[PDB]
Subunit: 267 residues, 4 copies
């Protein structure tokens, strides 16, 4: 029971192939009591999360909605019971308008589109920490999902820029969270075949972008000394759970790579 007795909020579930779905499942398998947040399609999300090993309250959260964020801590407290606080928070949220990715030229993404993507994908990590820190216990843990942006790559375009911003935000959140005895880290995962990504490989963002992303994935498994299985989010979910546990108690403002070791190898 890695997370026995811990109360953990998990955002970012939209389908059963969501990385956050697997994070939630493994966390419950390890004894965590969950509260879920979902964006927009709550009926869908409730139906999806019915399949989790245990029941978990579902709260609505649009990270671009200031009213949602202002009320979030109160709604969470209602859900877990007055006198109880969170031990863990999982940020598994990301989005970039199509103009900011794929075959649409990098220079052709309008700032309003870029700004929306950075809002949801980077700023909201700070938004969620602001909302939830006042209801977190000492020794608590905030975790976000990263895709290694240290080098540029085809197709990912402005989403890669958004991840660069997220990594910087994480280091500042660590400074704030430290006052509460709370850690803040990112997990940089290898590529995972979510619905959206499958759609992209299938050409949803242009044939050229599809081809490059497919090449990107193949080179990843090739580089990874222990391989990489894009169809399996479990090793990622387990890593997130390691950061939510008491077993990395001196790590904060940092990035843990769950990518098969691909980023440490050139060829």
């Amino acid at each position: 029971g890695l997370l026995d007795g811990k109360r953990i909020l998990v955002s970012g579930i939209i389908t059963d192939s969501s990385i956050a779905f697997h994070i939630a499942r493994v966390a419950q398998e390890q004894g965590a009591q969950l509260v879920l947040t979902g964006f927009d399609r709550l009926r869908l999300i409730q139906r999806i999360t019915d399949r989790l090993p245990a029941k978990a309250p579902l709260l609505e959260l649009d990270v671009q909605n200031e009213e949602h964020l202002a009320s979030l801590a109160g709604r969470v407290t209602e859900a877990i019971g007055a006198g109880n606080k969170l031990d863990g928070v999982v940020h598994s949220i990301g989005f970039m308008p199509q103009t900011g990715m794929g075959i649409n030229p990098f220079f052709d993404a309008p700032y309003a589109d870029v700004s929306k993507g950075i809002h949801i994908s980077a700023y909201s990590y700070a938004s969620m920490a602001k909302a939830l820190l006042p209801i977190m216990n000492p020794g608590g843990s905030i975790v976000g999902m990263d895709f290694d942006p240290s080098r540029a790559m085809p197709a990912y375009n402005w989403m890669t820029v958004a991840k660069s911003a997220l990594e910087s935000v994480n280091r500042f959140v660590a400074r704030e969270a430290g006052k509460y005895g709370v850690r803040s880290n990112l997990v940089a995962a290898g590529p995972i075949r979510t619905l959206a990504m499958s759609a992209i490989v299938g050409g949803a963002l242009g044939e050229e972008a599809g081809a490059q992303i497919q090449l990107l994935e193949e080179g990843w498994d090739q580089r990874a000394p222990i391989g990489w299985n894009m169809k399996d989010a479990t090793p990622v979910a387990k890593t997130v759970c390691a950061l939510l546990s008491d077993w990395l108690p001196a790590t904060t403002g940092d990035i843990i790579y769950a990518d098969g070791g691909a980023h440490d190898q050139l060829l």
Copy 2:
């Protein structure tokens, strides 16, 4: 004559202590023919640039203004003469609303403020490249100003996040500029006593932020094996000129540190 015969656009002059003022002066000393761009206070900027060693046309450019950007290449061509192209572009532009810096808590910066700062400080590097690449010669060079954001620090807050985004943007601009035979790099400078920074040390953004920034500067000179003089922008200007020259012809998508070597030393 390091830049003999080169035509170079320099943005970012606002006072005589602007880093871009020193970049422009050294470039002219080295034989460059300049075109300047300025934001908002053009009468002031013209009066300031009258002091440069040579005359240089001044064009208006608000990087948040789409009309300015759409017309920029045409206005530059008018200024340098049909048939002539730029060999160099200097981006020396940065801004973050006060809510995103200083003693104002990190979590209290409203996204609209953050988004404005990222627009001017990061996105606009791509905006300027889009506008100017069609009028740049092969072997050309685009340079932007960076402040090392790889670690978080007091007071700089969201401006540090904006610089993280800028570094990512630079790597993508390099991909685009490469098609034109053009390089794109950043110069990461140590802290420089511009008007704004002097104002901040003087408490303009809060006493606590002032104190931290003053401590930040002192530790910098201490760490730098060859020292660091915050009152002297010349070593920075020379580094920018090195990148505009033909002498780093295989460097692109990169960051050159002009910081006295401070970033490579821990204590």
Copy 3:
């Protein structure tokens, strides 16, 4: 029981303040069956390890001794029983002759001294992997101890160089270990008050080196958003155990920072 059922070799115990002593203790608390290796003073080491929660066989290993390394796998198999293999290996070994550290000038360390330090501190990580991989199970884990060498610092001198080499060796060991389904990682720890380090703060390597190291420690706790306690090796031991567990199964060739978050913060 984080390590229930796992068989783990732990090197590097010399006193009760050794980092490896705490790694061994926490591992036993979590259900691991240990085999220990020790260098030179085996009577001392046996007497020290008598205090561990459980009994554990002690084998002699001088990593500079080719005969010791050639026989190591056989002696380990004898200790754990034919048919059984290791699930984990901890490398907690480091040394640099005094000429390579402290107030002795950097340029005055003779290569023979440097070479000895690099042999014990970096090459031996590969030596131990070569010896033990043939007797490790798939899903196994090799962990070594690192001190972040990405920036230079006073006093540590050639030991910092040795750590840079170690980090590079780790990435190559990951390539080799991957063929066995085995991971290889380093834990970069903050400074810990071992006997040797206390001796150094006390002036054993010169007053100037003592003063700098004491300053180094103070700045560390200051920078760490969750603080850093140099007198407590437990948070480091727990991190090593996390890497020996099944909970970071997609991380290899990497560095996990157990340093209070100090390395991600500038001031």
Copy 4:
């Protein structure tokens, strides 16, 4: 005349395809007065350097020879004239025994071989700085040649480890050189078709190593936004000259990448 009036020592010439040969040629084209050092085959080296644009004294230097190093400053002073000092030093020296590279397994390199390679390839950067700093002018520059070792790669094996050590040594040399008003930097170059490398592509170190290195080169040009020509050392030589000039006066303990931008791009 980028280097007009400067006196510069250049090591590492062995054939006309040596990177140091091109560094020397470009430096002379830019007005530098050179002193050369060579290892072992001095008749060959003299005959090769006869082809440089200007005459230059050739001194013998085996960096593993303490007598050579002890006498080096005296011999250089003799060559350039009492009262004159060096403004620049180029370290272009590297070697690793065959057991430490290619298809020979990583684990099978004997430490004595590794230690020799690290001595010549990393330690000697410090050796040369120790010897020459006492005869360098303020504003002087020391430059060494690097091959980016931040990620592991096939075939390069222990030479990659040696480069990791070199990068760490450079940061410490910067600390020492700073007391003399002297800078120390590395140039990380893309792969260059020297004699040795051609031999390796041709299978001199095994067919598998040959194939991997050939693949390595192809991916490099592919990744580089401005391309990479392995048959042309000139862009590398020019970058080294930029660091020897007065145009990067605030850069020390650093690495400048002359690699076509390949290291900043993933695919």
